[PDB]
Amino acid sequence: MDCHLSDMLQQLHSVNASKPSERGLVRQEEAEDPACIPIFWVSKWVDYSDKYGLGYQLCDNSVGVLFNDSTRLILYNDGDSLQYIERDGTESYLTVSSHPNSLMKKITLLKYFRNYMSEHLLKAGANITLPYLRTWFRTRSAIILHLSNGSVQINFFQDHTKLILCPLMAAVTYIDEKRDFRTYRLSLLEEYGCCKELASRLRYARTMVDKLLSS
Numbered sequence: 001m002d003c004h005l006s007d008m009l010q011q012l013h014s015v016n017a018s019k020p021s022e023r024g025l026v027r028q029e030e031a032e033d034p035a036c037i038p039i040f041w042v043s044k045w046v047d048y049s050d051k052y053g054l055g056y057q058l059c060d061n062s063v064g065v066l067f068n069d070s071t072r073l074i075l076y077n078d079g080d081s082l083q084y085i086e087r088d089g090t091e092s093y094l095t096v097s098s099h100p101n102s103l104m105k106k107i108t109l110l111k112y113f114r115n116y117m118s119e120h121l122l123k124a125g126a127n128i129t130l131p132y133l134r135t136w137f138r139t140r141s142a143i144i145l146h147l148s149n150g151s152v153q154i155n156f157f158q159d160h161t162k163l164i165l166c167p168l169m170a171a172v173t174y175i176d177e178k179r180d181f182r183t184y185r186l187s188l189l190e191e192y193g194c195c196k197e198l199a200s201r202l203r204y205a206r207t208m209v210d211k212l213l214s215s
Contacts, residue, residue: 002213003134003146003148003150004150004167004168005146005150005152005167005209005212005213006213007150007167007170008150008152008165008167008209009206009209009210009213011167011170011186012165012186012202012205012206012209013206014186014187014190015186015187015189015190015202016199016202016203016206018189018190019199020189020190020192020193020194020199020202021193021194021195021196021198021199021200023193025193026192026193026194026195027192027193028184028189028192028193028194028195028198030188030191030192031184031185031188031189031191031192031193031194032182032183032184032185032188033171033183033184033185033188034183035169036166036169036170036171036183036184036185037173037183038151038164038166038169038171038173038183040058040059040060040130040131040147040149040151041058041059041124041125041151041153041162041164041173042056042057042058042059042124042133042145042147042153042155043057043058043059043123043124043125043126044056044057044117044121044122044123044124045057045117045143045145045155046113046116046117046121047138047143048113049068051068052067052068052109052113053065053066053067053068053109053113054066054133054136055110055113055114055116055117056117056133056145057114057117057118057121057123058130058131059123059124059125059126060077060130061077062074062075062076062077062130063075063110063113063114063117064110064132064133065106065109065110065113066132066133066136067106067109069087070087071084071085071086071087071106072084072085072132072133073085073103073106073107073110074130074132075096075107075110075114076130079096080095080096080097081093081095082094082095082096082103082107083130083132084103084106085132124155124162124175124179125175125179125181127179127181128181131147131148131149131151132147132148133145133146133147133148134146134147134148135212137211139208140157141156141157141158141204142154142155142156142157142204142208143155143157144208144211144212146212149168150166150167150168151164151165151166151167152164152165152167152205152208152209152212153165154201154204154205154208156201159177160177160179161174161175161176161177161197161201162174162175163201163202163205165205165209169185170185170186170187171183171184171185171186172184172186172189172202172205174198174201184198189202
């Protein structure tokens with residue numbers, strides 16, 4: 001279909017329409033649901049899309065690059081197994097250790113990205129406890145990352161806050177300015193309400209989802 005985007009749009013429409021912050025008394029912590037904790041999110045990213053591509057690390061320590069030719073290469077957390085996605089969407093598997101002629105340049109570039117992120121970038125959470133990047137864009141406000149499992153992650157530039165939206169769980173994970181990781185069931189945010197900050201980012205998220213659907 002559309003990689004679960006329509007599902008996430010309906011869930012976001014529903015939570016926002018419930019106006020969860022426009023109430024005098026609110027119990028946000030009641031909407032927290034430990035059954036909805038996500039398995040995957042983007043822990044690091046580097047935009048070198050002008051000439052090279054968008055590199056990223058997932059929370060399991062795997063690394064991926066979305067190249068400018070619309071292919072993607074993923075190096076698993078074992079540091080050897082590769083997953084290659086052609087523009088078709090066609091997936092193949094190989095190893096760094098087999099030294100494949102076909103992908104020598106792409107593996108080399110991926111390693112540049114991996115080397116940059118490990119020594120220079122801070123993990124998004126990492127104090128807590130295989131999909132690829134399907135598409136991404138940035139606004140002046142945020143980078144939007146749409147993973148192949150339907151998750152949409154939005155990293156806001158100004159305060160480093162983050163939303164991780166999973167449509168299968170109908171849940172949202174919010175990483176605050178204090179890098180604390182909280183997971184809410186969206187239907188519970190409707191029921192119990194929430195603070196103005198979260199409600200506002202969920203409003204922005206719906207706009208970003210509409211954008212992903214519009215393109």
